[PDB]
Design a protein around this nucleic acid. Structure first.
Lengths: 122, 209, 114, 56, 120
RNA sequence: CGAUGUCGGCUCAUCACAUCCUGGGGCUGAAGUAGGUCCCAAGGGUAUGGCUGUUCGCCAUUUAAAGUGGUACGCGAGCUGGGUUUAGAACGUCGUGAGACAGUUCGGUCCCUAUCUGCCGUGGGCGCUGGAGAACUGAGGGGGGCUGCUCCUAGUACGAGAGGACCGGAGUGGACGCAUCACUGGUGUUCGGGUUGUCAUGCCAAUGGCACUGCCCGGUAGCUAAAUGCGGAAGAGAUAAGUGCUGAAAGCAUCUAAGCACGAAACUUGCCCCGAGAUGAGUUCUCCCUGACCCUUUAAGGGUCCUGAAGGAACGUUGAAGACGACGACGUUGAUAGGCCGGGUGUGUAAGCGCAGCGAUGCGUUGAGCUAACCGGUACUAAUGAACCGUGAGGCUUAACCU
RNA sequence: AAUUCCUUGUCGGGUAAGUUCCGACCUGCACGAAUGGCGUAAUGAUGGCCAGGCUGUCUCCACCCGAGACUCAGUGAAAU
RNA sequence: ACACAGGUGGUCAGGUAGAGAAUACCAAGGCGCUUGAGAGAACUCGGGUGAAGGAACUAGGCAAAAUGGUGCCGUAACUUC
RNA sequence: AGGACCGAACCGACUAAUGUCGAAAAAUUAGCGGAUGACUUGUGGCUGGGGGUGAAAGGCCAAUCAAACCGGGAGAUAGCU
């Protein structure tokens, strides 16, 4: 579970070192994001020869959260660092194509099916 | 349809083989014996009065024991009410057990919650909470304004001030009945059921299909 | 109780191994992708075990590809296929929650070798 | 945060008309001494249920 | 809310809760009866009684577990040899409670706690 | 003007339709998808920010939607004092000056123990006409009514094409609520271990007191959330705006004057808690009691003797009950509490000893010792035997039916 | 500008976005060289702003240790 | 005005940890506040905690929280040096 | 050496809360500054009301200061309560 203003990191290699969450999609006053949620971000730190820079309003999808995903049996999956992966503003189908760090199984639906192609694990 | 009564004996988990962990609830359904059947010609409406459990000798009184005496049934611990659904028929003394609920899929469980006590408005009605260190003084948790200025000149009836939270009677709905076990007399129904580990419950079939 | 406990022992599986905290177990979990009913495993460090019989579970921390996922498993559930210790560690604390705060060399334990 | 018209005497004791007290109404006696003492206490001289337990 | 919590708070901080019961159970053994309030002496029982089960089970070690508790060298010597095989016989409950009236000052309903003893 | 505290930010809301969204319908320059305006409709929902002294305003990004207006331009005997609106000070300016400014900058006490309405609750008296019991009906009065998004129907219908559907089904999310701890967590100055400096018990060892629990890492019961089950109808009645059929009056044309029909989140039902002090105080199955005796203004009478029922209460150990009471459980014709035993769980290798080693300390006995509340047994002590309050067949009038 | 009506003035950096702000254009409503002008590192219990560290101030609070709040008894006001 | 958390100037000034008289605990030497006893709710007051987050709160990082010591290594634009 | 530096006694009073029928006719508990000095303080004198003092607020002169406090003109004057 991650809500606004959070200095999240980014798991693929687009340019994004540390991004920040500002407007959590999908809900009319939804405060909370997670296991497959779509949040809206911008980059605060890039590499020099990245696709992106600091200062571009972008749309992402969470995978890691430091609170963890609830499995249907009662297993919890805690990481030690949040991550979301950058996409297009509207043609989502992500920018970056090599991801560091694993993911969890709860995306798995027809839109993010690249992420099991770029999964390193799970 | 008629409902039935027994205690509530805690919570556990029931594990399906695929890996779902249903957080389950146990309800111990005794013999539920019918004590008096009421009817339209003598009461204007028809229902039944049920009686359950075992109670000692030297506690039930002769105004109580007399209405037990007319059936030939034993000293139960209380007298509840269940309305007949105008089809099903019963007799005085007849026990009706947990295998009644064999073909139900959902039940409406109702009972008395815990007594949370004389609880604050932050706790009771979920008023949102103000500041606590900005220079604020002596209004850290209390509700605030309770009404408009001069022209109402009173308070409306029912404006959500603190009350002794809990212990009324709280009805939960659409509870998936999980398992109907007849031998150990234990009834298993999905979810979170009001009551303590031992209180009184009323479980009845769902009107909301 | 005795009433509800009698329900608890008729799905509780019979022989699990003993792990302490500080061991390096392998816990292979069941997982379903579409039609296939397959096996996936975990190679980490057990750092806490909470005993309540049917309600027991344990926290096994592996350092995966850049970060240390910390995953739990409810011990009597049908999701867990197998339990096998790789190496045993001589810890003193019973629920090591401070091994999220060490990485690399300091997060090694020892061997028990009792 | 003060009164505005004087309460009477008739509104006064009707707050006091629950302020009565209830003394004892039971006062059991001893098995040996037959002395008045409080129910489930001991006597002035020290008995309880036919037992001298003050050790005086 | 107090739902199935144990203990009496007895307005006193938590050092003063146990470390008073340090001394009253340190006084309950010497002359074996006292006079004190009802809601203290109803709480003195549950602390002076685990000094007894230790005292019917004698060793070097559990002598010191009743020295890590009540902290009187004469009481633990009065334990284990004067009390010990005096109540080593039967199952538990080594106290009598017979309530004993009211204070002259402030209606603090005093009670007697005494050991099940003194047939003299 | 012998006081009515003033913009604004919380918190708390509540009312009106001139409706921002949801629902119904008409019309179109309504092909479809989107729209536009006119009505019907107040049941519910009704952004976070950057900025600003903020309502006011802009942009960003959400949203099914971020409606508008009333309540001293709502709310200080509820809070904050940033705004102007005390005196200190300054820039500019106007005036010789003392000094003033819809001209800006800096700093500058917000008090009050609730008598009375009112409100969430909560107990006592006593009434309901003999008394008590336990259980209910239901007059009546609240709650609760939110809303996308994908898929199939069908890439269809309408369209050259791009595009792209209504009523209908399914599942998953958002927001508020209702519980519930079984898991995921937090809490656990009573717990088990570590440990800093110090003090004592004669000293080593071992322990305990003090230091914001001394500072620490974990932690049961419960208390609870972010944790997880449920909640908003489906169905019915009578009506809106409309849509009508068969027809009149006005031989024909007309949704209406007679009359018959659908038709909305609104209006009564449906579901849920309160509820016979519903003084119109009600039904229901019942349990308890049927001695003597003067007076009389013979009044629904007082009086004295003898008794004092079922039961309530009183005191008692107490309770997931609790502010004090109330309400629940039990009261030796005994499991109501504290205990003790079995265990669960927690913290994890007591103490002592033996040996290794110059030692700090390591290994064996030892996954030991210890454990607050929790779970299952046993009377070990403590929940006296009585007295107390309450009663002796229950006013009169009037038929139906019985002597 | 601590000097500014139009005024949130017009550009640029900062922010996703800036009536605050930092460097300037010059047309100062109404600066100005001892009712001192400009720059100035130290210095301030200074004014505005800003990232990091940081934490319950907040999103949305929940347990807990205690002194009163509450019950029983003793003494006992107050404005009004 | 009071047996009042408010002020009054010199002197003596012990042990062990510590730079020190501050602090932490004790010798000696004095005291326990002149209402107690229960209860274990909202509720202020003085606080210990804390899941994911990190100023989104707010007029304002005021308040909480954070850091913190004696040594060696090592440190800038500017500058009156 | 030094109106150096950090910091207790002592000095004071920048922030926050308690209080504001207060423990007190503006202090108390945590934090904030000078702390070898343009400092701080005890006893003892001098300055007296259009007068004093004053690193200047119109601040202060016995809990009261844009003109002290007690007495006396005096029962001032009161187009007004």
């Amino acid at each position: 579970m991650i809500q606004e203003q959070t200095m999240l990191n980014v798991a693929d290699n687009s340019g994004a070192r540390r991004v920040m969450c500002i407007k959590v999609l999908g809900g009319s006053h939804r405060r909370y994001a997670g296991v497959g949620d779509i949040i809206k971000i911008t980059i605060k730190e890039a590499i020099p020869r990245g696709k992106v820079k600091k200062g571009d309003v972008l749309k992402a999808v969470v995978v890691r959260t430091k609170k963890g995903v609830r499995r249907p049996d009662g297993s919890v999956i805690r990481f030690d660092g949040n991550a979301c992966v950058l996409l297009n503003n509207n043609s989502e189908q992500p920018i970056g194509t090599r991801i560091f760090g694993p993911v969890t199984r709860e995306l798995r639906s027809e839109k993010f099916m690249k992420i099991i192609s770029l999964a390193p694990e799970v | 349809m008629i409902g039935l009564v027994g205690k509530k004996v805690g919570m556990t988990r029931i594990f399906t083989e695929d890996g779902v962990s249903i957080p389950v609830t146990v309800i111990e359904v005794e013999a539920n014996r019918v004590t008096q059947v009421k009817d339209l010609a003598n009461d204007g409406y028809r229902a039944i009065q049920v009686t359950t459990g075992a109670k000692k000798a030297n506690r039930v009184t002769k105004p109580e024991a007399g209405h037990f005496a007319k059936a030939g049934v034993e000293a139960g611990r209380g007298l509840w009410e269940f309305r007949l659904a105008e089809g099903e028929e019963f007799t005085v003394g007849q026990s009706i057990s947990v295998e009644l609920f064999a073909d139900v899929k959902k039940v409406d469980v109702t009972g008395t919650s815990k007594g949370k006590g004389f609880a604050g408005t932050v706790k009771r009605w979920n008023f949102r909470t103000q500041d606590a260190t900005h220079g604020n003084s002596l209004s850290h948790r209390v509700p605030g304004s309770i009404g408009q200025n001069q022209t109402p000149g009173k308070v409306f009836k029912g404006k959500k001030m603190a009350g002794q939270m809990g212990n009324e009677r709280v009805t939960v709905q659409s509870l998936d009945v999980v398992r109907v076990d007849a031998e150990r007399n234990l009834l298993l129904v999905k979810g979170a059921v009001p009551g303590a580990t031992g209180s009184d419950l009323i479980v009845k079939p769902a009107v909301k299909a | 109780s005795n009433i509800i406990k009698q329900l608890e022992q008729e799905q509780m599986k019979q022989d699990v191994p003993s792990f302490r905290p500080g061991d390096t177990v392998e816990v292979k979990v069941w997982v379903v992708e579409g039609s296939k009913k397959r096996l996936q495993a975990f190679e980490g460090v057990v750092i806490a075990i909470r005993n309540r019989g049917l309600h027991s579970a344990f926290t096994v921390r592996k350092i995966s590809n850049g970060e240390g996922v910390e995953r739990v498993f409810q011990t009597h559930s049908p999701v867990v296929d197998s339990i096998s210790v790789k190496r045993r560690g001589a810890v003193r604390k019973a629920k090591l929650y401070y091994l999220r705060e060490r990485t690399g060399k300091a997060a090694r334990i020892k061997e028990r070798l009792n | 945060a003060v009164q505005q018209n004087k309460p009477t005497r008739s509104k006064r004791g009707m707050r006091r008309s629950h302020d009565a007290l209830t003394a004892v109404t039971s006062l059991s006696v001893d098995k040996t001494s037959g002395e008045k003492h409080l129910r489930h206490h001991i006597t002035a001289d020290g008995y309880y249920r036919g037992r001298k337990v003050i050790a005086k | 809310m107090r739902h199935r919590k144990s203990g009496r708070q007895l307005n006193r901080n938590s050092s003063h809760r146990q470390a008073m019961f340090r001394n009253m159970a340190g006084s309950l053994v010497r002359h074996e009866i006292i006079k004190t309030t009802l809601p203290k002496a109803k709480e003195l029982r549950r602390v002076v009684e685990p000094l007894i089960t230790l005292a019917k089970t004698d060793s070097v070690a559990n002598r010191r577990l009743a020295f890590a508790r009540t902290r009187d060298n004469e009481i633990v010597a009065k334990l284990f040899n004067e009390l010990g095989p005096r109540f080593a016989s039967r199952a538990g409950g080594y106290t009598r409670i017979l309530k004993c009236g009211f204070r002259a000052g402030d209606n603090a309903p005093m009670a007697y706690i005494e050991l099940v003893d003194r047939s003299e």
